[PDB]
């Protein structure tokens, strides 16, 4: 649901139209995405859900679509 919104947000950032993206796909530790993609994700969260402070910007929070969805859920109460 958020996971659906996160997967929708990420697909157009990937290296290829056919890049496999599941809820457990590694995004940053794999160098699939770089920090210009992280900026797009931060800016999407800022405008759609609850803006994230620096303490939320961790590889544990951002490395998979499931982790991003969990981050937005946790931070949107």
């Amino acid at each position: 649901s958020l996971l659906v919104d996160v997967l929708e947000l990420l697909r157009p950032l990937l290296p290829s139209a056919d890049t496999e993206l599941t809820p457990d796909t590694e995004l940053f530790s794999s160098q699939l995405l770089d920090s210009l993609a992280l900026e797009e994700i931060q800016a999407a969260i800022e405008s759609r859900w609850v803006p994230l402070p620096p303490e939320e910007l961790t590889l544990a929070n951002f490395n998979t679509p499931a982790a991003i969805a969990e981050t937005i859920a946790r931070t949107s109460t």
């Binding site: 210009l36 931060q42 800016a43 402070p53 620096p54 961790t58 590889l59 544990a60």
Partner: protein, 346 residues
């Protein structure tokens, strides 16, 4: 949960502080309200390490080593330990707090930096030997935050690299910081007193300068620090049209690389400001003082500045540079009103 911060060493110190019952972000960082513009510029010739005019910001003030030492009655000591004493030092420091152990980025597999020692050395906190003989290392930088395993031989190799561009050779900060029972009982009293003192320092708005082999270093504290910083940063407006060109000379490519790095470094200081201000608000809440400041949110104002900085170093253009200056001016305004209201209640 591993504690962390926008600066690796602060994250590391927060983990060590928790071992001895000290909440570093709230009682040490959050108790030290600060705002400083720093400049390195041409002073008296010769200054062979002055490579460029440089400007940044700091919300660290005197810094956690000074405050953590006087608040605990302990010591935070820098040493280059001989290899034959490193492991004994790591075991000995653990009784009374712990150690920040420096190493190159390329010694830390989780940094994905095999091909470079990085601009500066990294730091970790050794957190004991596990059942299998391997060291547990705490990573205190928010992005990589967590616990990692390293073999003892790999740890010693990391402490004594060859070559050693950063001079990491047995470099430790030993935190012998365990408070007495009577001091532990009063940490929030000391935090209250440090909070008032830093607020008075801020309003005193001292400035200074020093001539060094790396340049004249100038600093300015207090309510005008961020206005002065913004006025100075306008001097880097040339980066916008220069970063848009696609055919840059080696020298112009260096100007852009160094200019982007100035805003990257600044952005990490803005992240730290948001972290520190959040600590201040947790401190004020726990002291029962949240009443007298109302709902002012200097943490949120600095968070907005940090985001403007990230946008600018990621894409150097005039709109992004103007947005950073606006966010910084807003943070300056919220800071001075918050500081004045809070000191009135102390």
């Amino acid at each position: 949960q591993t504690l962390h911060a926008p600066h690796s060493e602060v994250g590391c110190a927060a983990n060590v502080a928790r071992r001895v019952g000290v909440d570093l972000a709230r009682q040490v960082i959050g108790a030290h309200w600060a705002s400083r513009m720093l400049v390195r510029e041409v002073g008296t010739f010769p200054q062979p390490l002055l490579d460029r005019t440089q400007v940044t910001f700091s919300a660290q003030g005197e810094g956690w080593p000074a405050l953590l030492a006087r608040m605990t009655g302990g010591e935070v000591t820098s040493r280059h330990v001989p290899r034959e004493e490193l492991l004994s030092t790591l075991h000995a420091d653990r009784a009374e707090g712990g150690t920040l152990l420096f190493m190159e980025d390329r010694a830390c597999p989780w940094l994905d930096s095999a091909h470079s020692p990085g601009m500066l050395p990294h730091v970790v906190v050794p957190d004991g030997v596990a059942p299998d003989g391997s060291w547990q290392l705490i990573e205190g930088h928010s992005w990589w935050r967590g616990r990692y395993a390293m073999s003892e031989q790999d740890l010693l190799a990391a402490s004594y690299p060859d070559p050693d561009p950063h001079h990491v050779a047995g470099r430790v900060l030993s935190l012998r910081i365990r408070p007495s029972a009577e001091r532990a009982a009063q940490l929030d009293t000391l935090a209250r007193q440090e909070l008032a003192a830093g607020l008075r320092t801020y309003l005193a708005a001292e400035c200074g300068e020093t001539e060094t082999p790396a340049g004249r270093i100038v600093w300015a504290n207090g309510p005008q620090s961020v206005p002065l910083l913004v006025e100075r940063l306008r001097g880097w407006d040339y980066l916008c049209p220069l970063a848009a060109r696609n055919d840059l000379s080696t020298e112009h490519a260096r100007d852009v690389a160094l200019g982007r790095y100035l805003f990257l470094a600044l952005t990490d200081e803005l992240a730290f400001a948001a972290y520190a201000r959040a600590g201040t608000l947790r401190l004020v809440e726990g002291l029962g003082l949240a009443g007298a400041v109302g709902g002012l949110r200097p943490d949120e104002a600095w968070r907005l500045a940090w985001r403007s900085g990230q946008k600018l170093y990621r894409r150097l253009d005039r709109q992004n540079l103007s947005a950073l200056f606006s966010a910084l001016e807003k943070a300056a305004e919220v800071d001075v009103e918050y500081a004045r209201r809070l000191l009135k209640e102390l």
